[PDB]
């Protein structure tokens, strides 16, 4: 049977699987419902939840800190990340394609210096008190909500800062803000602009396979400490329309993919909803959508638009793509004749004819 | 809404979520309720249980082994810890501030050699078989809890130690002792305290934070392997009565605290019971009470007493912290004011302003 | 009470725990039930399934890949084990007492090579998408099971391998085989044979323990990387019928331990199904059972026959063998007098002499 968008547990769509936390004229923030909700074949994605952020030019999401780790990527555009500490301030400036991680607790901010071009955001989330859940906890006060300094008593807040809670509440508390994200002046911006491990970025060297059709970028946790610690990879992969990514699997890295801009269908062969019959998933993806990739599933990528998609590796370290076509990395072609003529009814010259007919590889037509 | 006591989650009051394994008159054997069971909140402090041991002067705790790992810390008093493996023995003796890991299985037993000083232990334990529970098994047979070996068939012991069953359970078995703690004769004990990695000593350092009102005594994994293996730390801070710590918050630590002497009020702001609104708890600790600061919640502790506190960190390695008053380690301070400006209503030269006031560290009035 | 058999957790009996996967003329490929569903005792081992293998001479295991690392281990016979990477072929024999992993995802295939001997194989198996599931995928097409590429559209696999998809059909899937255990005439063995970490072996090296009566091989993690990944020791261990291995307990890890050849009665001493009392549990073990050793639970091993039995060690790093009798290893024999004699109700040396009665160490009469 072929298991279709709706009823398809690995497909994500955007406007109905993501939940608005906050949204107002300049961005909006939404979470990615839980993994292991709808299907024990991702039980071990239960610690992961996905975040979205979209932020309108020169607007700053105000301060605060969340009790998870982040994986931040910046799908479109630049933002000017800051990380606070309680010894010392640290900023960066992030183009498309770059990435880093934001360690649990660590206060921090962003803002979008551009002036009209948008600010796209992915975020992979690791709590820590709850595995499925984490806690955003804002400094700033703001007719939507409100400062975490505010849950203290009068008694403490006022030996804690010395000063009258009337002076305290003024200054604080309730001439503020009404959300979490707020636009500022060009000179504002400029301002905290001059400053701008540390980020990188994965579109920035050799991609593992490339051709007329597309080019694929990964960076892996052997060359990256950040990286190394989530043991995770970080993934991104253009192609065009027309173009087919042959059907592979990933040896144990369990992929979780979102699609930055174009369309496409997906076709991933995995387990019935305790045997060895196998089921089909299939679903069209458009600009947003989240499609799980479970690993040792053989999976299928069709552009039918030219498209630019990103996907994270969890349990990544030493993990192997294996094509089931084509020349690079075609592991079925490394099955020695003898033992093919037995797997497939034909003979074995038969098969593996068939199997070198394709002379492309990864990035085809269709 | 103000979570109190009773309804607080965080809290655990000794004498109602204690639950007693032994006790006669010479010492007690307790053990907190589990964590997860109160709040998802705490879900990944399921994998840990604290245990409470009290001990009268010169007497010793008979011979036995649990199946979990144990962070052994003396509150007050002295004993001499005795570690026994199928190739030698290996003793120590551990002053108040003394800690040491206690291999899963490693057969081990306690005496306080002390003459009128009694004896106060806290115990972090990590299960094997079961993340929840461990299980005690005592090598001695009393009226209390029955022997390990007398598990095993006559036909077994007779064959393993090479005798009747009779001999055997006359030795062995059923002149003994009513309970598994039992006294001893000076003598006896001067004998068992000629001998006396290895034990290490928190309040023996630098403190990290200092000053009129108290110190702050913290050993981290980086400069501790057993505390490594466990990836925790271990800390201890003494405030006099009337004392504050001012509010402040650890990165990714999760921290067990128990109130050694003294009394005090904790102030904890953290998550209601998937929104941005924020709780408060609060409640008031007192002698051998547990706290949990989940990773990330602001917290703010008043000594009502001259009191001391012992605190694991679990998930420790790395970990900051986070003080939102006072000079040092105060993230607050370090927002750049342009930022500030925006996050609160106030000007940032003003917010700073408030901010800088306070010229007092981690210990302040109140 | 003894719970014996059908009520006891821990004896899984073959003919009744284990789930035929695939069965036929020449093999067969059956799983273990999950060891938590049994008892929480054996929460931990949630994560592992065993798996075993049986193959007539001459026969075939078809080319395939689960989602699951695999420790494999040959109880009896001799195989030739292949892994396939998409940049290479790796080919070795392996012995009677040979093991290897799989990493989760490897294409592989194996044969038994012999002529009229029969070959056993056990596998531990650890699953990624599902902590107590694994999903094989068969790149073979059978009257059994169905080709995993036959889950792709035509449009792809026509795309994907150029042709149309007639040709395809007819080459790749519906001539073929009914099962996937095929046998091969003794040219095409000859010829996948020539080629024949790396597997190691645990039998090929001084035992730890020796004497008349049997001989314990065992092979850790602090020396093989394959299993320092796993964080598992190899174990075997034979005896003479008559025999008995000495009340003992591991430190920290879990065994899981199967019966090769042989008969034997197993005593384990456990816990009761949050008390001290302690409960016995027993049952007869007989080729192919599995038993299910907690970590510091004390046991006995009694041949009533000549066995030689294997045993896998979950959270093995560092763990220690303290037996309870005997003079190796007898952690009873390091608790000093004064304290044994406050232990047992017997005076010191008559417990300490008791002890030092059997001359003997594990491996003693009955």
Redesign the interface.
């Known amino acids: 049977s072929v298991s279709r968008g709706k009823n398809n547990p690995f497909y994500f769509n955007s406007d109905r699987w993501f ?1 608005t ?2 949204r107002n004229q300049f961005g909006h923030l939404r ?1 990615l419902q839980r993994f292991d909700q709808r299907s ?5 994605l239960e610690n992961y939840r996905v975040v979205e952020f979209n932020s309108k030019p020169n607007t ?1 999401l ?2 605060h ?3 998870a ?1 982040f994986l931040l990527v910046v799908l479109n555009g630049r933002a000017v990340l800051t990380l ?6 640290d900023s960066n400036i992030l183009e498309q394609g770059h990435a880093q991680k934001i ?5 921090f ?1 962003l803002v979008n210096p551009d002036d009209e071009e948008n600010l796209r955001i992915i975020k992979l989330a690791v709590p ?4 499925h ?1 984490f ?7 703001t007719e ?10 009068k ?2 807040l006022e ?5 009258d809670i009337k ?2 509440s ?8 009404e959300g979490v994200i ?1 636009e ?1 002046k060009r000179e ?1 911006i400029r ?2 602009t001059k400053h701008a491990d540390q980020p990188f970025n994965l579109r920035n060297q050799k991609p593992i396979y490339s051709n007329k059709l597309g080019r694929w970028f990964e960076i892996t946790p052997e060359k990256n400490p950040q990286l190394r610690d989530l043991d995770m990879f970080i993934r991104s992969v253009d192609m065009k329309e027309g173009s ?1 990514l ?2 592979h ?4 890295a ?1 992929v979780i993919l979102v699609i930055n801009e174009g369309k496409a269908n997906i ?1 991933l ?3 019935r909803e ?1 045997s ?5 998933y ?1 679903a069209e993806l458009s600009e947003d959508d989240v499609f799980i990739i ?5 999976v ?1 990528i ?1 552009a039918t638009s030219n498209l630019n998609f990103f996907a994270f590796g969890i ?1 990544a370290e ?1 993990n ?7 020349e ?5 072609s ?3 004749t ?3 003529d ?5 003979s074995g010259e ?2 593996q004819k ?2 070198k ?2 002379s492309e590889s990864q990035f ?3």
Request: hydrophobic fraction near 40%.
């Open positions: 939940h936390l906050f979470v024990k074949q991702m039980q071990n700053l105000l301060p800190h969340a009790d780790d606070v500490n309680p010894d010392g301030r360690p649990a607790g660590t206060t901010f820590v008190n709850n595995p859940r806690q955003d906890f804002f400094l700033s006060s939507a909500q409100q400062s975490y300094l505010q849950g203290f008593s008694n403490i030996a804690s800062f010395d000063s002076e305290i003024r200054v604080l508390f309730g001439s503020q803000q707020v500022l504002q301002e905290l087919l042959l059907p699997y990933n040896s144990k369990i076709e062969v995995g387990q305790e060895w019959e196998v089921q089909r299939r479970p690993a040792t599933y053989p299928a069709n349990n030493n192997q793509r294996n094509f089931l076509a084509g690079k990395d075609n592991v079925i490394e099955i020695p003898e033992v093919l037995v797997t497939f009814p034909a038969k098969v068939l199997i007919k394709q085809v037509d269709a």
